[PDB]
Design a protein around this ligand. Structure first.
Ligand SMILES: CC(C)Oc1ccc2c(=O)[nH]c3sccc3c2c1
Ligand SMILES: [Zn+2]
Lengths: 46, 161
């Protein structure tokens, strides 16, 4: 596992002409808690 | 005896409903046309469980306070999706360096998405791997998938365009 950029706790990947929302990276496992376990199927478009 | 218990939420519970809405409302179309995560506009939610672990919760709040104090009392805490073949190990033992994406665009760390459909591309591995274990189908509409909806401390975040 790499280090966070000096002076930072995380990285934000800002989204090209898009409807895309952000992605994020932490370099310490302690900086996330798995609050909810979601069980699901993807649904075939009609 | 990891210390982890799972509590089922009723579909009638406001907490179930707000988590489902964040899951459904953050689906988008992907540039791979569904190659990694499958072709879909929405999910069938089968179950939502609260993950309860005193030790792992205290591990989180201890680190949250360290970050907060380095950042004018601001944890910059988000609720974000995580998809992984290792969700079972994560809920029992917590996130650690073994859940890191070594080949990630933003370096070897643990990745989270605002888009549920982005995290869905990783449930069966990097780029969807070989898809569902039963049918080897990245777009399987039969097999049950799991995503984590996670509390994440960002603190001071480096903005990469
Ligand atoms: C592509 C990258 C910039 O964004 C992401 C966004 C979400 C996730 C995720 O939910 N799980 C996993 S497991 C390995 C990588 C990822 C991942 C990567
Ligand atoms: Zn399947």
């Amino acid at each position: 596992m790499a280090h966070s950029p000096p002076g930072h706790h995380s990285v934000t990947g800002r989204p090209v002409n898009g409807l895309a929302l952000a992605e994020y990276v932490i370099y310490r496992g302690e900086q996330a808690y798995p609050e909810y376990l979601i069980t699901y199927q993807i649904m075939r478009p009609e | 005896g990891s210390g982890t218990i799972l509590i089922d939420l009723s579909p009638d519970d406001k907490e179930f409903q707000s988590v489902e809405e964040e899951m459904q409302s953050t689906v988008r179309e992907h540039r791979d046309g569904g190659h990694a995560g499958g072709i879909f506009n929405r999910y069938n939610i089968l179950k939502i469980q609260k993950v309860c672990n005193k030790k792992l919760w205290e591990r989180y709040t201890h680190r949250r306070k360290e970050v907060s104090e380095e950042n004018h009392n601001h944890a910059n805490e988000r609720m974000l999706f995580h998809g992984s073949p290792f969700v079972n190990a994560i809920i029992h033992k917590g996130f650690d360096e073994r859940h890191a994406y070594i080949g990630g665009m933003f370096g070897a760390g643990i990745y989270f998405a605002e888009n549920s459909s982005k995290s869905n591309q990783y449930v069966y591995g990097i780029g969807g791997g070989t898809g569902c274990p039963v049918h080897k189908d990245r777009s399987c509409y039969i097999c049950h998938r799991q995503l984590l909806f996670c509390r994440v401390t960002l603190g001071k975040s480096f903005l990469q365009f």
